[PDB]
Amino acid sequence: GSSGSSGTGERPHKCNECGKSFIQSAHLIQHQRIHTGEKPSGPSSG
Ligand SMILES: [Zn+2]
Numbered sequence: 441g442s443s444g445s446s447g448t449g450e451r452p453h454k455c456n457e458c459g460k461s462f463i464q465s466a467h468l469i470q471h472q473r474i475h476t477g478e479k480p481s482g483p484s485s486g
Pocket of ligand 1: 458
């Protein structure tokens with residue numbers, strides 16, 4: 441059991457991709473991007 445992000449000082453917003461955290465949502469909503477980029481090659485229509 442690797443305890444991570446356990447202690448004092450937490451945020452109401454956390455990334456579901458890696459697990460990071462941010463004070464404001466706008467901060468996270470933007471970060472999550474680093475995980476999902478643009479792939480116009482994929483077959484997925486649209
Ligand atoms: Zn992340």
